[model samples]
Target: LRKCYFPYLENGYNQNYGRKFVQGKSIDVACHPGYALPKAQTTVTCMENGWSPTPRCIRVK
Candidate 1:
């Protein structure tokens, strides 16, 4: 999971909607908006495979 915080601000969006993950699969992850913002532009790659899906950086608010 990643933040990609201000991607939407630069790309002319307000927020990032969501992300998708698969169990027992090593999936490449990414974020939308692809711009600069506070707490944005973060990336994380899964080293181990087959784990419970965690909300990377999704806003609960």
Candidate 2:
């Protein structure tokens, strides 16, 4: 896959997967205020299929 796409989560999100994709590549994700994500899970790996463990930001309201 070129990029990880998660259209289910609510608004307020940032994804930095660079300009392209390749095997063993990585991507990053961050949440805006009032949202939280596991620090260790912020990075995802690109495999033969797609990014693994699409980290989702949890609303802390």
Candidate 3:
């Protein structure tokens, strides 16, 4: 099994079940209120590169 460093998602925070992030695990993320999260989804899966589909949260207005 492989592990990865804590993903740094700007404007949003993610939750990792394990203290140490492990590879191939999906991460749960959420955008702060009033912010816009594309696709109404805020989840990312860990890859050999760390995280796929870089998480992004932008101002609603």
Candidate 4:
């Protein structure tokens, strides 16, 4: 199986960078303070291509 790099999500961040993760592995991601995700954004799984349900945290007041 090919490995994938920790995804760089907009307005959110991943703890790991340049790290290797294979498909079927669960990855952890979180939004910055005062930001919200439009949909499922945390603790997602990696597909053969990359992360599933990619997150884009929205700025919240």
Candidate 5:
């Protein structure tokens, strides 16, 4: 399995876990306290190719 990295994210994922990207793995992404994922899906799954829909977080204040 290849490792996946969220280049756009700063601090939101768990670093004490595996670093490889596996298919069918659940993805939980977050943003700053005030940020919102209004246009992005909160739950995502890793596919053979890549994430179904790329997650995007935005400041909602």
Candidate 6:
């Protein structure tokens, strides 16, 4: 399941469990079943003003 909305997050995103957001954006993300996702894989991109939407994870499968 996935969802999106307005207003960026206050704290940094939770990279664990697959969360990927900007430096000041926060999000609730999840991983696929039977998989131990790593936090390092998750990353957030920032624009010139350090404001950008949360990034979605890339799938290699």
Better of 3 and 4 by TM-score: 4
**Residue-level lDDT for 53 in candidate 1:** 38
**What residue runs in model 1 are displaced by over 4 Å at the alpha carbon?**
1-22, 32-55, 58-61
Residue pairs in clash, model 1: 5-40, 7-33
How much does each candidate deviate from the true structure in C-alpha RMSD?
10.0, 4.2, 3.6, 2.7, 4.0, 10.2
Cα-lDDT of candidate 3: 0.57
**Alpha-carbon error at 16 in model 5, in Å?**
7.8
Q: lDDT by residue for model 3 over 1-61, one digit each (tens)? A: 5565555446655554234456687666676776544565566666664555545666664
Please give the distance, in angstroms, between residue 41's alpha carbon in candidate 5 and its true position after superposition: 2.8
Better of 5 and 6 by lDDT: 5
Distance from true position, residue 31, model 5, in Å?
Answer: 1.2
Query: Model 6 segments beyond 4 Å from truth?
Result: 1-40, 48-54
lDDT of 6 by residue, 1-61 (tens): 1222323322323344332334444434443433222344433333332324333433424
Query: Candidate 2 at 42: error in angstroms?
Result: 0.6
Q: Tell me which of candidates 2 and 4 scores higher on lDDT.
A: 4
Candidate 5 lDDT by residue in tens digits, 27-57? 6666667554445555545655355554455
The per-residue C-alpha lDDT of model 6 at residue 55 equals 38
Q: CA lDDT of 61 in candidate 4? A: 40
* Candidate 4 C-alpha lDDT tens digits along 1-61: 6566776666777566567778778766677887655463456566664656544556764
Candidate that scores best on lDDT: 4
lDDT over C-alpha atoms for residue 25 of model 2:
70
List model 2 lDDT by residue over 23-56, tens digit each.
5776665666766554546565665534565546
Q: Give the lowest summed-lDDT range of ten residues in model 1.
A: 2-11
lDDT, candidate 4, residue 4?
61
**Candidate 4, after superposition: displacement of residue 55 in Å?**
4.3
TM-score of candidate 5 relative to the true fold: 0.45
